[PDB]
């Protein structure tokens with residue numbers, strides 16, 4: 221006893237058991253199905269036409285849901301016949317739109333994070349405190365911090381890996397990495413990885429290369445990896461002064477133009493270079509606050525902020541030039 225959705229591009233159908241599972245208070249498989257059909261309709265205008273010709277969905281009855289799926293599946297067959305005619309088939313090889321990606325990542329997450337409660341079982345007041353950066357902040361990061369095929373992206377402390385997946389889907393960096401130390405999120409990230417590749421194949425959408433790794437970003441191996449990374453993302457809000465200090469040491473080896481996006485600044489925003497602070501990491505970076513997304517508040521009730529650091533040794537060079545002057 222099952223529900224099936226055919227892939228728009230001929231991948232293996234998506235199959236859902238009955239009764240349909242629930243993911244949390246605001247997400248279940250029934251609505252995932254309905255939204256998936258909605259989104260495939262956005263990918264294919266012709267399919268959207270066929271679906272207009274709409275019905276009552278209850279989400280409680282098998283026959284009603286089996287009915288909805290059958291109507292979608294029949295419309296998919298016909299579109300597939302259309303593509304055998306003269307009609308150009310949906311272009312493959314494209315990136316998903318923002319709206320489609322959101323849905324894809326929610327879907328991947330719901331299928332991968334089988335017990336979301338388990339992510340809260342970290343040692344409190346430690347660097348392992350878990351918190352998820354929202355899809356919208358990542359989207360803003362992607363928009364403002366323009367990346368090219370020259371860039372290498374790393375999420376330091378990548379959790380279940382969903383920041384990496386979003387960036388990999390939206391940009392053409394040569395490679396994207398996430399590294400995560402804790403067992404529970406790193407275990408989930410393995411399923412996130414498989415579900416992402418599967419679902420992206422299912423929709424016929426491409427992503428850049430990425431790897432999700434278990435590891436410790438303070439390790440010897442990671443010193444060099446960090447030095448060669450051009451865009452670092454790091455949700456360091458709960459890392460603490462010790463870990464932040466260790467990261468500063470790693471960042472001091474980065475190249476000009478290297479960028480770090482973080483939820484807590486690595487240097488003060490008003491940094492004034494002088495004779496006492498010569499070795500502070502502030503001597504080699506510009507730090508700006510990224511614009512808050514309209515009406516977004518933190519647990520502090522203040523607009524949640526992220527910070528962009530750009531490696532710029534020009535700061536230091538200019539100070540030393542000034543010392544050869546009046």
Ligand SMILES: Nc1ncnc2c1ncn2[C@@H]1O[C@H](CSCC[C@H](N)C(=O)O)[C@@H](O)[C@H]1O
Nearest residue numbers: 351352353377378379400401402436437455
């Ligand atoms: N030394 C270290 N190496 C790898 N991961 C670390 C670490 N110290 C802390 N972390 C991880 O950093 C994560 C912070 S939560 C942020 C998760 C994700 N990047 C997001 O923004 O949505 C936690 O999972 C914690 O385990």
